[PDB]
Amino acid sequence: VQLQESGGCLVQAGGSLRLSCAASGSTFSTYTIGWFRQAPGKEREFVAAIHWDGGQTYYADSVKGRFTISRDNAKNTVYLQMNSLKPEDTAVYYCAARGRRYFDFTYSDVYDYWGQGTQVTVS
Amino acid sequence: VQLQESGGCLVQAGGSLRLSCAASGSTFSTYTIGWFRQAPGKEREFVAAIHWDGGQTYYADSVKGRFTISRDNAKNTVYLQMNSLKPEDTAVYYCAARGRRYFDFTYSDVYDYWGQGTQVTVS
Amino acid sequence: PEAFLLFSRRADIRRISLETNNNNVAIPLTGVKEASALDFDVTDNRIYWTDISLKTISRAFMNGSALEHVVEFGLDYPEGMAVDWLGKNLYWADTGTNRIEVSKLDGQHRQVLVWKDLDSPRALALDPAEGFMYWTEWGGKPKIDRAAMDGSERTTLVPNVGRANGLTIDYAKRRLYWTDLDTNLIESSNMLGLNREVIADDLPHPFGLTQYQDYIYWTDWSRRSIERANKTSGQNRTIIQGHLDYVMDILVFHSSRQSGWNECASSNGHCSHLCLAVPVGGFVCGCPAHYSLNADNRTCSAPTTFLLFSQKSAINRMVIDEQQSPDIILPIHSLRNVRAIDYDPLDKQLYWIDSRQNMIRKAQEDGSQGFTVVVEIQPYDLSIDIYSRYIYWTCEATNVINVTRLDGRSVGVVLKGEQDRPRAVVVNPEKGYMYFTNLQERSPKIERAALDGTEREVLFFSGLSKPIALALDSRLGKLFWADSDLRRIESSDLSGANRIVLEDSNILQPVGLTVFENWLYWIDKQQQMIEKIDMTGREGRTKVQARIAQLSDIHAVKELNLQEYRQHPCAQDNGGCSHICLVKGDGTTRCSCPMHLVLLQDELSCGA
Amino acid sequence: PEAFLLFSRRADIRRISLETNNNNVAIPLTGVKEASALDFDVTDNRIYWTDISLKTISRAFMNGSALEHVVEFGLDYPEGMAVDWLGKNLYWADTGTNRIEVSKLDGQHRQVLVWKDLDSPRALALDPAEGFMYWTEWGGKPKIDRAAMDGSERTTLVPNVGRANGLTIDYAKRRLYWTDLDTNLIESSNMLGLNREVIADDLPHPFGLTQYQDYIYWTDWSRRSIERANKTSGQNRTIIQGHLDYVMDILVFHSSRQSGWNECASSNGHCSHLCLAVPVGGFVCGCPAHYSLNADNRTCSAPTTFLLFSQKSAINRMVIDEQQSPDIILPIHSLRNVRAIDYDPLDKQLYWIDSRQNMIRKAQEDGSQGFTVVVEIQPYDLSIDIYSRYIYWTCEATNVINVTRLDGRSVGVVLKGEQDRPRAVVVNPEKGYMYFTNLQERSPKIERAALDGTEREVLFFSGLSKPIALALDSRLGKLFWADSDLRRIESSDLSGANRIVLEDSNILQPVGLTVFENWLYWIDKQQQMIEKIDMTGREGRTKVQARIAQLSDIHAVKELNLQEYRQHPCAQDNGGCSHICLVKGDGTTRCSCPMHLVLLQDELSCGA
Ligand SMILES: *[C@@H]1O[C@H](CO)[C@@H](O[C@@H]2O[C@H](CO)[C@@H](O[C@@H]3O[C@H](CO[C@H]4O[C@H](CO)[C@@H](O)[C@H](O)[C@@H]4O)[C@@H](O)[C@H](O)[C@@H]3O)[C@H](O)[C@H]2NC(C)=O)[C@H](O)[C@H]1NC(C)=O
Ligand SMILES: *[C@@H]1O[C@H](CO)[C@@H](O[C@@H]2O[C@H](CO)[C@@H](O[C@@H]3O[C@H](CO)[C@@H](O)[C@H](O)[C@@H]3O)[C@H](O)[C@H]2NC(C)=O)[C@H](O)[C@H]1NC(C)=O
Ligand SMILES: *[C@@H]1O[C@H](CO)[C@@H](O[C@@H]2O[C@H](CO)[C@@H](O[C@@H]3O[C@H](CO)[C@@H](O)[C@H](O)[C@@H]3O)[C@H](O)[C@H]2NC(C)=O)[C@H](O)[C@H]1NC(C)=O
Ligand SMILES: *[C@@H]1O[C@H](CO)[C@@H](O[C@@H]2O[C@H](CO)[C@@H](O)[C@H](O)[C@H]2NC(C)=O)[C@H](O)[C@H]1NC(C)=O
Ligand SMILES: *[C@@H]1O[C@H](CO)[C@@H](O[C@@H]2O[C@H](CO)[C@@H](O)[C@H](O)[C@H]2NC(C)=O)[C@H](O)[C@H]1NC(C)=O
Ligand SMILES: *[C@@H]1O[C@H](CO)[C@@H](O)[C@H](O)[C@H]1NC(C)=O
Ligand SMILES: *[C@@H]1O[C@H](CO)[C@@H](O)[C@H](O)[C@H]1NC(C)=O
Ligand SMILES: *[C@@H]1O[C@H](CO)[C@@H](O)[C@H](O)[C@H]1NC(C)=O
Ligand SMILES: *[C@@H]1O[C@H](CO)[C@@H](O)[C@H](O)[C@H]1NC(C)=O
Ligand SMILES: *[C@@H]1O[C@H](CO)[C@@H](O)[C@H](O)[C@H]1NC(C)=O
Ligand SMILES: [Cl-]
Ligand SMILES: [Cl-]
Ligand SMILES: [Cl-]
Ligand SMILES: [Cl-]
Ligand SMILES: [Cl-]
Ligand SMILES: [Cl-]
Ligand SMILES: [Cl-]
């Protein structure tokens, strides 16, 4: 299993942006895909997670109402729709996966696969 | 740095045994060498540690008076002299090293190098 | 006694009092990474938990003392776990390995109870007073199954359900409770799976579940809480504690949930190992995996003949029986890169080569009494002379055939050549000869020589590319090799005559051989297969197991007939030879030496 | 307010009240692995701690929130750390890197204060009210040094001492306190290192020290305790709390230990960045690393000319000055395997190739605004055309020269071919040509072509084995290359004439080249060295830095002449060309295309 994030760039305050996580080497029917972000000088923070089989979604309070995690019906791809971007949303956003469905999705240590991350800067 | 334990075997209760830890890439002027044990179905337990430069020794309560840790003066080898061996002393004995002096020597996670361990069984 | 609630979350197991003001305090454990399932034994004041990250099931007292990892091998996703407090047994369900297993509460006598047609079991609940066992399945068609607590009488109890969680038994009112994670409901049925009732249909995200007196307890990952309600109407709801994110499991620690009795609680059913409950309230005696129950239905006998096959980081065992028992992984610790394996049927110990540690190690099937025989060097293959108690192994680094006693004392080198590349090797001490592949550059050979290195004979020099495996059967007088490049397995007489291709199709990477009696087993690393062909010809080529990654070797073990073993003339203290004891064609013995010694005038000792 | 004691142990930082002498309670922090040194800022209610395992220095409030890692790069063993509560600065000492550094309490404007002739500094103590800082050294000859808190007027204060620890200042009584770990003593002296006194000579294992009012506090690893005694006599001893194994540091959180005043405490001394105290009670304005203080002695100017050299997982910067300022690592995140580097002097951003990620990335020197330019493919070397805003890079997998805009939009491929193996590359847009090494099988070549791929010319085909690096200086008309196999560096004219060997001795593995002013710099990966030769021939070959592991590339950055840049005809909207803008020998421009397009009749646009 390999993961590749994409979509990060410089974006204005109040603007929108959609990230995507391409996946390889599985059907991921037994996987949970989660998004994390890490700003310079801060601890890595949980953003959102989704069951590939089931559709259950889970969000952090700091992105509730603004961020939406979704699943592609065609190309093995998870999306992170980010609306109403604040300057504090500036971080490198990582895509993580684990072959287990119900667990503490904020627990980053127990995930099995990570991507290179993509940088989102909000002015 | 590479470590290799030796000396483990089968020994009667109340007998004596001396283990040794060979060395390579000898950066040992700045290293602490510690001994660890792990019985089947039990957590890894700290035994003893020594400052290669300094000569300070530190021991666990379960081995005080019975065990002795020492350095060789020509071989780059740390010894663990085990006297008054109890049956519960049965474990795989590991040699660990860290390029730092003065720290929590029981903190096995912060050591930098390990050996393959040697099996000591006490009847 | 006082009742309190235990719950798992992250790497902590915590305690909440139900009588006092909720005093959330953590149980002082150590080494926990991700605690999931929970259970207890009130008479022992012990708690049990599974760790999905570490793939372990552990135990400890409520004060944190006597922390023990009672299950450390063969786990993948141990989601379900339950304590048999009557028979003092530990049950668990692994979603990955697709197995329901049992063992003593300390880990001894581990046995597989359900393994056939089992797709992802999740929650598990026990009823040892009645002898029944209930679990949920997240397989292709989710359902709730039932079986006796010895694995028999398996049946579907609730077929019409989603992926259920937190299966809980109300022992007083005879009702089953569970959380359907697909429909987000808390449901209940009776013990027969009928009279379904919806207890709570307005909850945001229920997960964990337990029952106590008139109440059910559950965790809600959306409200981040532990809540309680009337177990019948679902009313009188209350929050026990909030701000608890992603609580995995909950239970009420109280003696009122571990009642009842059976014969296992009184006398262990006079069983030597396992006392497993069966309906209605009875018991049967069980054995560890691959052990057999004797005619007394109480005692257990270890397997006498079996197959061993090793992977890169595992050594497994397999038997051939009527019920077709599953293969198990032997609790051998610190396996890094196992290349070849062997077995001494006298002291019943396992030998193997670890190519990353570059050593030859030894232990029992218990995993205990580990010992390194040989420690640069690069052991490639090995073969045990069980009569002279020696190991014949090839060194890939120095290109020699080295001999070593079982206790680690070196005998010496019996073969070395300028351009010799000895690799695979098999010993035939009944006749006094050894066979080995010689992978010389662009000229691979299969050779034979006496066990002291003399009488070297090239048996085959054509039709070979990479002969990588060897096997031998002394009663049939047959030699077997497998070519990984030419992708075929051949056979011939020990003399070298009657060379025949046994199989040469649908074979990708054969890397191991062994003989049971009339069957020739082999392993295909690329196909991840263990297959066998019938050498007497009655039956055809069959597969025995598939989807086995990183296969390395395979070795059959036959029960040793001790009186026939003692009849071998080198079994009685090496026949007086200080080193190599050689059987000659007439049945008597001769003494010989490794190449750095010479035989002395006494025709028994070797000196430098 | 009330005074309490903070101590570090394992991954915990805990609080002990002195009103109760117990009440042990942990500070709710996360992500801590091995807490070591401790300090505080009483006006901010903040604590500071170093993590030896994570190589970080962090801070947070007593509540637990606002947890920030203010130092994340360039640390090895940050044993010493102290807070400048008056000037709001963070000081620390790294035993591994052998450096005393300073920055703002949030981490901005990091600067190196001591780095010359400094062997293993351990404990560190600040006296900002007077302008002195004191530290212990575990070097070849242990001692206690003193210097101004800007790094100046360094001196040895106590030369005759063992390896000291827990250096503490009694600001009321003007006394220094420390623990001699080699003699197990608690010693003291006055602020000039005189009047030595032994405070306690019968302690089993003292470690970590602090002082408050009439008492000194220490931790004893042998007795596993925190203890206290009369600061003068050493008697009236008492145990504060026991059963605390291996406590690393202690301090008394109270306002009476952070007293005094200086002009930095009022409006930062009108300094733009760093306000650093100097004796006696004065101050001097400071600047970040490689920044220079302006003529107003208040504001700072960024470096306009510097060197960049990369390692496997690091990119460093180095200046050439009279001070001989130390090199620093740039805070670039997620560096896995840096293969080559380049720099855009217009937008002042750094470019590099990561071979493990197989991308070409971009970032500011402070790590911000990271962006992936190109992301199977395997970028090998890159060279930036700063006038057309293009990146010329070679693909190791497809063996092409691919052209990409700085914003990631692809221009196209300008060189493909049978037998072609383009590797190293340098562009010369001032003349309209590019130079690249062609590592064809058993026939390496150094070739030239126009920036559109036309006018291909093999400049050199002999005296080559593995030409691995390329450099160019347009003003001198010189091409430079390094051969890693033949172990030499050569030079020639851009026309290809006047080939000469520059160096061919004491060179093991040259893997990079760059030109500063009249110096040719190169990196020797095997010798772990950066060296330089004077191309004017006046001065000799000199080493500039050694013991640099895993060297990858080196690249010089000259201050951009805005006037000379805007005079380049492709600098203004690419000279009207839709793709490739080419300077002629006339000085005017042509337009050209990649190979999947063709130039239209307008002589400016490319169509398919
Ligand atoms: C938990 O929820 C319950 C409702 O689901 C609460 O109410 C209890 O309900 C029972 C009856 O269900 C009531 O107790 C009495 O019922 C008898 C008749 O008893 C017979 O019928 C019932 C129902 O068929 C059966 O369960 C019995 O075994 C008998 O066969 C009436 O004659 C009485 O007048 C009285 O109504 C009560 O409503 C109540 N039981 C109590 C208060 O003991 C229950 O209270 C909830 N528990 C808690 C702790 O809150
Ligand atoms: C065949 O296997 C045996 C071991 O089963 C190898 O014997 C080992 O040989 C090495 C030297 O090659 C011995 O090390 C030596 O130790 C003595 C001290 O007793 C020291 O004086 C020497 O300088 C050398 O370091 C080692 O002890 C020995 N091990 C045993 C168990 O005897 C033998 O080398 C193998 N044959 C070949 C051809 O490699
Ligand atoms: C030279 O480098 C550029 C990138 O700097 C390479 O362009 C990339 O080429 C791939 C495949 O040719 C493109 O992927 C394709 O995208 C289209 C959607 O436009 C999709 O329909 C295809 O199935 C495929 O996924 C990729 O978009 C493109 N990227 C850019 C920025 O242009 C180019 O291939 C390199 N040339 C050579 C000869 O290697
Ligand atoms: C932790 O609790 C266990 C079990 O309660 C203690 O083990 C034994 O407990 C029984 C009663 O259940 C006593 O009769 C035994 O004396 C206990 N064993 C020993 C060796 O004393 C265990 O002692 C407790 N440990 C601590 C540190 O409190
Ligand atoms: C965490 O502690 C800090 C320290 O007081 C609090 O943060 C700020 O504290 C200052 C006083 O130094 C107040 O003037 C600010 O109003 C505080 N900030 C905010 C956003 O309230 C903070 O309140 C504490 N956090 C908690 C949860 O108690
Ligand atoms: C709530 O609980 C009380 C007992 O405290 C019980 O008598 C009552 O019937 C319950 N009410 C409802 C509406 O469930
Ligand atoms: C053991 O049980 C089997 C069947 O359950 C029965 O045939 C056999 O006679 C029993 N033996 C004894 C000794 O009870
Ligand atoms: C400490 O000892 C000195 C004598 O050396 C004494 O004068 C002083 O009062 C003592 N202080 C305390 C706090 O006990
Ligand atoms: C402290 O020491 C001195 C003399 O030893 C004296 O003032 C007093 O008795 C001791 N105790 C206290 C509490 O001051
Ligand atoms: C800067 O400092 C120097 C020496 O410290 C001094 O001579 C000079 O006047 C200062 N600059 C200004 C603008 O005051
Ligand atoms: Cl000591
Ligand atoms: Cl010693
Ligand atoms: Cl823990
Ligand atoms: Cl019963
Ligand atoms: Cl198993
Ligand atoms: Cl020359
Ligand atoms: Cl240097």
Numbering used by the authors:
A (entry chain D), B (entry chain C): 3 to 125
C (entry chain B), D (entry chain A): 630 to 1004, 1013 to 1245
According to the publication:
A key mediator of β-catenin-dependent Wnt signaling is the type I single-pass co-receptor LRP618,19. The extracellular region of LRP6 comprises four YWTD-β-propeller-EGF domain modules (P1E1, P2E2, P3E3 and P4E4) and an LDLR-repeat domain preceding its transmembrane helix. The β-propeller-EGF modules harbor two independent Wnt binding sites. Using functional assays, we selected three highly potent VHHs that bind LRP6 with nanomolar affinity and efficiently block Wnt3/3a-dependent β-catenin signaling.
X-ray diffraction data were collected from crystals of LRP6P3E3P4E4 in complex with L-P2-B10, L-P2-D07 and L-P2-H07 up to 2.6, 2.9 and 3.4 Å resolution, respectively; however, data from the inter-grown crystals of LRP6P3E3P4E4-L-P2-H07 were of poor quality indicated by very high mosaicity, which allowed for initial structure solution by molecular replacement (MR), but not for detailed structure refinement. Even though the two VHHs share the same epitope on LRP6, the paratopes of both VHHs are different. The CDR3 of L-P2-B10 is six residues longer than that of L-P2-D07, which explains a difference in binding orientation of the two VHHs. Thus, similar to DKK, the VHHs act as a competitive inhibitor for Wnt3 ligands by sterically blocking access of these ligands to LRP6P3.
